[model samples]
Target: KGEELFTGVVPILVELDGDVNGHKFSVSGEGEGDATYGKLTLKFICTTGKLPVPWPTLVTTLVQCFSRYPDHMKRHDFFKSAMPEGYVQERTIFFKDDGNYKTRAEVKFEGDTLVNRIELKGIDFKEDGNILGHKLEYNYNDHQVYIMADKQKNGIKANFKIRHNIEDGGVQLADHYQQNTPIGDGPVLLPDNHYLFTTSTLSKDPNEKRDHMVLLEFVTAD
Candidate 1:
């Protein structure tokens, strides 16, 4: 079991559809984490998750973001008991720029437990004083939920490209229709690792008048 646990932390790469108008949206963030050597390594990746597509108000986005957390209901009280006095009351407003909305997030220590929340005032979102999900599990540890935004099609779509943490470093992962094309929504299984730029097509369409189209591709890092 010791050997099974210590495989190297090789870099991981991910890509998600960022078509916000196509009823889908994406999120990405990178943070420095402590590694075996105590050196700060900046690991970054992108994943998908549900958003209340159709341009949900700022309040709607705030609620939807937290609703996905594992223990959202129980954690509200925990946050109130631990946050510093007047922290949330002081800063609790949401703003919209261009087409996206921005909200403030806070992390407070509550009796050995960490409670996080986001506050969005521009819309009718509920607030336990915090605006973001504090108990979110990162994709690096739990690889199953690759993306977080909603799965429904709202006629809006975005294309997201990601770059992994590496030397000389960025890669793109979308597919073109003229290529060999891939078979499915990826995490394309390979002998050693995943591959990028996978293409999928509607090969079984009955209507001959409409030309089949290939979906986009994705990339993975080494």
Candidate 2:
């Protein structure tokens, strides 16, 4: 009799949730992950009562823009064009937890689309100091949502793909990879092949109105 050993990675599923202004929000779908590739999809919405003050207005404005353009508008362009007067973009960079660093970008609005954008970034996880950035974009024609980059330095290149997952209630990543090409500065061995997947969702439940949740997964290639 002969027996075989199993050495492959297994897929994983996880749920994410959080509280805002004393209101609770949670996603319905679960995130999936495995050895080669992983995917996370989520839809964020108001759960219980209406979002706190300016938030509701901000959301309304964004909805109108998405419904109006619904085609080809970068998130930055949307804010530059559709953002109401008196609103402003605020950016900050700071250090956290010893050597860790962080950057944040936020905007405030009134009516319909309240919070146009809130972006975060970091540069501490990778041994080679690779940057981590995340943002979101809206495409009107297809009613698509896109996750975008915030900023980068030292000639870094990364590629990603996004698709609208009806079940998840938003756009989700289909694939992500680094160019893996050497830069002119010098020759260096890049980190091993790995994948990190993340997603967020919104709630529409009366008790959990405007709830937001996120899921994350990390997988290594075989």
Candidate 3:
């Protein structure tokens, strides 16, 4: 005997999957214009059925992908001032707008890894508003996943764009409104380095820790 499953007081009946822990885990959104529509394709693999995998793993994966797609994540040598030498080992600091916060970089070459540390300091509450900063530390290994570590938080920390004369070494870091992205996986920095890990009202709630922050490549170098 075949019986029709009916949804109470609904013109059409929808099939459901299973339930767990007092929650109805059903295929609510699927097909065109549905929430799950875009999820139908196997874009990425998920062994644990999680939204975001581990960042370290993601970084490793990015390295693998980057090797195949070098243009995907191109590294930029942002200069503060023109140096007589080709490339000197030095530590530089970039000051923030209020002149209170600062972004410092320590660049050095240790064997195969190019060790670089970018630090943001002076994230205190001000009359204007609270500020946050982030300290990102990464190492570039030869054709390997960029090892990322030492993540520190500040009142306000995000990625921005600055136009500097590669020849003259003049640096100007204005609020390039277009050069921002949700923070995550230690500054992804997309294929085209236009956007950077950014934090905003929508991305972060007032006075709340901003999670899911990743830097994706937004622009490509010419």
Candidate 4:
């Protein structure tokens, strides 16, 4: 059986096809109230297994769906600022110990290739002199981004896949360390042309009282 419960100014229409094996879910209409309700509908679908896709895949797909709509992204400040611009990138970082960290990035494009350059400064976590800066280079034709670290910096290395959904005008960035590591794996949506800048360290002990995490935002340069 399929059912929908609606209550709002815009009157959201949610439909659930009765076929459990091939459940069909949909939400339509517009309004702040309707958008919120629509998100709730997606979340319900995510947890209830109405979609045939795996949970993670379904979640990412739905998030991209939400991001496709300008109105949806515009409603959130963080999402709105995540859009890419040109040569410059602006980001706001948050850390419990560091309070708030801000960064400016310079990006250069050569044909279809991109190089990002940034200097490390005034950040609480890393030693001021340990690592001066970092460089990243990726070609537009390639869907994966890698941190160009040399052997001297054996401790520093990372790579991730970048997916662009042109129909929705949104990009999904996903990365996992060391091939099979699942920690910190998830779909991060950024407006096309933008990159994700963040770091996280999982606690070695599951029962540890504190876990280290960082919040980061990136925007295209002006």
Could you give me the TM-score of model 1 versus the true structure? 0.19
- Where is model 1 more than 4 Å wrong at Cα? 1-50, 53-97, 121-222
Q: Which stretches of candidate 2 lie over 4 Å from their true place?
A: 1-155, 167-207, 214-222
Give the alpha carbon lDDT tens digit for every residue of 22-80 in model 1: 33344332222111211222221223444332111221111001111222222222112
Q: Model 3 reaches what TM-score against the true structure?
A: 0.24
TM-score of each: 0.19, 0.22, 0.24, 0.21
* Candidate 2: C-alpha lDDT: 0.26
Of models 2 and 4, which has the larger lDDT?
A: 2
Ranking under TM-score, best-scoring first? 3, 2, 4, 1
CA-lDDT, candidates in order: 0.22, 0.26, 0.21, 0.23
lDDT of 3 by residue, 60-159 (tens): 1110111111234233212111111111211112233422323333322223222222332332323232111121112111111121211232011223
**Residue range with the least summed lDDT across 10 consecutive positions in model 2:** 1-10
Compared with the true structure, the alpha-carbon lDDT of candidate 1 equals 0.22
lDDT per residue for candidate 4 within 30-135, as digits (tens), equals 1121222222221122223333311221111111111122343332222212222213333333322222223343333223222233321223432221111111
